[PDB]
Design a protein around this ligand. Structure first.
Ligand code: NI
Length: 173
């Protein structure tokens, strides 16, 4: 089950701050403008440890008051940057591997309903790793994790990683 930082069920379509489990790992999630992006379309972990980052909308593919047990979810900024077609995060291929981004294009649900929270056993509160579920063509398979990769400019980019999956606690905004 998806539970928030205070022990309560996460609400379908509700807004939360995605913060690290370990205080020293940084602040919340936000955006950054990288490469040739017209506006901040790169999803990153804030450069300020005190910041809760951006309020994030969490939604599953089901009509429910709360995020159903073990369901896939879409994640989006409640207040996205101007040049994004929608608030939803999506995973885009690149020379270095899949990266989490916002898009200037309208996205089909199969391109945004690609995340799944996985509870970490060793914890007293509810902490979750973020799984990325790629296309098993007819359906999907959540066999990868989202992590951080600092680029040349220091931006802590959210990307599919082979090690050190990021962990998060969901604080109601
Ligand atoms: Ni941890």
């Amino acid at each position: 089950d998806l539970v928030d930082a205070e022990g309560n069920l996460v609400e379908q379509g509700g807004t939360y701050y995605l913060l690290p489990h370990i205080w020293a790992h940084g602040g919340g999630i936000e955006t950054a403008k990288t490469g040739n992006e017209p506006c901040p379309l790169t999803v990153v972990r804030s450069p300020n440890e005190v910041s809760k980052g951006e309020p994030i909308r969490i939604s599953s593919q089901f009509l429910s008051l709360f995020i159903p047990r073990g369901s896939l979810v879409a994640l989006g900024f409640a207040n996205p940057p101007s040049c994004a077609a929608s608030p939803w995060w999506t995973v885009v291929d690149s020379p270095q591997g899949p990266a989490v981004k916002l898009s200037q294009q309208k996205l089909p649900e199969k391109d945004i309903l690609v995340f799944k929270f996985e509870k970490v056993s060793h914890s007293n509160i509810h902490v979750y790793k973020l799984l990325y579920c790629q296309h098993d063509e007819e359906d999907v398979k959540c066999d990868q994790y989202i992590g951080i990769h600092r680029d040349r400019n220091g931006n802590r980019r959210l990307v599919v990683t082979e090690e050190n999956p990021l962990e998060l606690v969901l604080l109601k905004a």
